[PDB]
Structure formats: structure tokens, C-alpha cells
């Protein structure tokens, strides 16, 4: 059987600007199976409420997923996903950079 | 629209 | 060109009884409509704002045909199962993927059909759509048993006519939206890595459709990118975004160029920093 690692990108919807309301983006994609736990993070906290795209794949075969929440940047505040999936020995944590 | 019939396989 | 497809995806749960079914459909690079057989509604549903104003008619027809793809990808999953001689304790995935393509006149291009199993290429239908074709040697009974029946036929009806038929109205309906080419904002970056050397990062914030190129240039240019370049990533509000990056020596800088090829730019952009 195939099983493909999820690719992670953390980022926000539009340019940070410190206090403006803005959105927290994790997109998951390139993974097999379809199985997949993802959570956003606020200060290590896991912020609930979180909405995530219709279960699609592309061309060769591997899954993508786009989790989300509203969130608002400030400079002291740290932001990360977690994910967790059968390839993965232990649970990934990516931070969020504004930079990327 | 989808596909309105599918495969056996 | 434009193009409608959809994706199914089909994964058993020995535990709890009945599969999971998903089915998604898109225009080009905008997903319309879905399908879940484990959701508050299973029920097709509108997936973007120009499907609202669609009859119970229309609703009733594509969940119908949600419904019987699943269990007929009930059925398929136990019989793969006895294909792989895998035993009845895991979790497997069924997956079926098909789209039809019109070129610029606006007129039926091309269509295509696959299946697969536990993410690899199962069964295949033939370019011309007369026929299948199995890609995994495990499928050759399903190529039969499938070509035998004269299966081919009804698929390539609906990639020829129903698809593009449909693709038309769909077009109609999202124009406002679908139609409009939305070139990116740019941008590059700069992010010093130490005192000898730095990172240029050239930014494309927002764009649509999704394909889109940028290209790392300095000059004498043997070659030569070798550039950290990320997979175009969604933002969220049907736009796309995406960066490519190099290391440029500090001081030297300037003697980068980024290159921004898109659809909705009337001509390539040029950064520099």
C-alpha cells in the first residue's frame, strides 16, 4: 500500500499587520490516506472552531486540505499547526511565520 | 454534473 | 479553455459499517459543489454562491447520483479487497476522478476517466474513450470485465456531451466570477541570513486562476535558479498565493530579477527589490 507524508504551509490569508483581523491558513496537501487530524495553535493553545475545505485530491491521487480559523496577529502572540497522520512517527508542529 | 454511472469493478 | 471536474473519494471503516463517500466538483479552479455521505445534509450541495438559485430538481438528480456511485463503491471496495487478498481489519481507498475540457473555440477538447486503489492507478480509460485500460496488473479483471460490458460507451457519452453541455451552463452562471482573470500583487522580499549572505523572496498574493510561474534571474546567468520554490497554496477566498526564493550574496542583491508569468497580467512583471 502507498502512503504519501503530508506537506505543510502555515500562513495567513492576507498580509499581517499587527491588530488587523486577518486569517489563519494551514494547508495540508500531497498526503495518502485521506486520515488527518489538524489543529491551529495559539501560544501552544489549541484554538477551536476551525473550518477546513471539502476532501479533494489532485492528479496523483494525494489528498489537500485547507484548515482555518479567524485570528488576529500581534507581536508577542505565536501561532503554529499540528499534524498528526498515520506517516508520521509523532505529531508535526509548523509555526507560523509572517515571513512565509 | 457528475457522472451518472459508475463502474463494477 | 475550461474545464469541469470532479473527484470521488470512497474510504471503508471496518468498524463503523458503511463507507465514507466525498464527491467534489469543480470549474476550472473553483470547487462549485460536494457531496458527504457522513455531513448534517447528505445532499449535494452548492459549494459556491452562483449555485444557490438551483431547484430541488437539480439537487435531488446529483445526489441520486452521489448516492448510487457509493454504493456501488461499497460494493467495489469488498470485491478490490478480494483482488488484493487484503483481509477485511483495514481501511482502504477507492478513488474516481473524471473531467471533460474545452479548448478556445469553447468546444469539447478532451475527457478523461481513472480509478484508483489505495492511492496507485487502478483502471484507466483509453484517450479516445472506447475502451479501458488496466495500469495495475491487479486491474486486468476489471479491464474485462469492463470492456466486455461495453462500459466505455456511456462514459464517453456523458465526457462529450452531458459534461461539456453542463460546463456551459455552469460558466453562465459564474461569469461575473469565473471569467474574470485576477493578475497577482507582487512584491519581493528581502531577509539577510548572515552578514555574507541573504534571501530574496519574490511574493504573488491573491491571484486567479492558479497557474502561474516566477523565475529567479541574476545575471551571468549559466543556468541557474536553484530556487526554494513552495506549491501554489490557496488563501482562503478562491485566490492563490506563492513565493520562490534564493540566497544572494549581500551587497549583490540588485542583480536578481524575478520573473511573474500569469493569465490576467497583460504581459510578465519584473521584480527586482
Do not use: I, T
Given at each position: 500500500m502507498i502512503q504519501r507524508t503530508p506537506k505543510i504551509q502555515v500562513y495567513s490569508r492576507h498580509p499581517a499587520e499587527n491588530?488587523?483581523?486577518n486569517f489563519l491558513n494551514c494547508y495540508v496537501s500531497g498526503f495518502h490516506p485521506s486520515d488527518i487530524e489538524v489543529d491551529l495553535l495559539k501560544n501552544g493553545e489549541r484554538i477551536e472552531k476551525v473550518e477546513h475545505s471539502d476532501l479533494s485530491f489532485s492528479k496523483d491521487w494525494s489528498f489537500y486540505l485547507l484548515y482555518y480559523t479567524e485570528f488576529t496577529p500581534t507581536e508577542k502572540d505565536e501561532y503554529?499547526?499540528?499534524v498528526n497522520h498515520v506517516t508520521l512517527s509523532q505529531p508535526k508542529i509548523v509555526k507560523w511565520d509572517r515571513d512565509m | 454534473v457528475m457522472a451518472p454511472r459508475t463502474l463494477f469493478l | 479553455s475550461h474545464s469541469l471536474k470532479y473527484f470521488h473519494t470512497s474510504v471503508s471503516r471496518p468498524g463503523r459499517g458503511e463507507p465514507r463517500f466525498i464527491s467534489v466538483g469543480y470549474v476550472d479552479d473553483t470547487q462549485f459543489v460536494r457531496f458527504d455521505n457522513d455531513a448534517a445534509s447528505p445532499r449535494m450541495?452548492?459549494?459556491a454562491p452562483w449555485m444557490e438559485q438551483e431547484g430541488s430538481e437539480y439537487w435531488d438528480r446529483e445526489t441520486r447520483s452521489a448516492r448510487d456511485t457509493a454504493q456501488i463503491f461499497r460494493?467495489?471496495?469488498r470485491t478490490l479487497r478480494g483482488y488484493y487478498n487484503?483481509?477485511?481489519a483495514g481501511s482502504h481507498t477507492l478513488q474516481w476522478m473524471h473531467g471533460c475540457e474545452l479548448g478556445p473555440d469553447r468546444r469539447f477538447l478532451r475527457?478523461?476517466?481513472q480509478?484508483?486503489?489505495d492511492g496507485k492507478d487502478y483502471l484507466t480509460l483509453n484517450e479516445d474513450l472506447r475502451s479501458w485500460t488496466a495500469v495495475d496488473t491487479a486491474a486486468q479483471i476489471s479491464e474485462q470485465k469492463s470492456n466486455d460490458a461495453s462500459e466505455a460507451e456511456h462514459q464517453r457519452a456523458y465526457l462529450e456531451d452531458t459534461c461539456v453541455e453542463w460546463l456551459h451552463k455552469y460558466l453562465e452562471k459564474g461569469k461575473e466570477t469565473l471569467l474574470h482573470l485576477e493578475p497577482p500583487k507582487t512584491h519581493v522580499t528581502h531577509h539577510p541570513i548572515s552578514d555574507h549572505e541573504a534571501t530574496l523572496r519574490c511574493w504573488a498574493l491573491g491571484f486567479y486562476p492558479a497557474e502561474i510561474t516566477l523565475t529567479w534571474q541574476?545575471?551571468?546567468?549559466?543556468?541557474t535558479q536553484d530556487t526554494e520554490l513552495v506549491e501554489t497554496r490557496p488563501a482562503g477566498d478562491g485566490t492563490f498565493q506563492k513565493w520562490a526564493a534564493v540566497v544572494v550574496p549581500s551587497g549583490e542583491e540588485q542583480r536578481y530579477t524575478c520573473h511573474v508569468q500569469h493569465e490576467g497580467l497583460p504581459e510578465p512583471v519584473t521584480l527586482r527589490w
Open positions: 491588530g488587523k483581523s503554529a499547526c499540528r | - | 450541495v452548492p459549494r460494493v467495489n471496495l487484503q483481509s477485511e475527457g478523461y476517466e480509478f484508483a486503489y541574476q545575471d551571468g546567468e549559466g543556468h
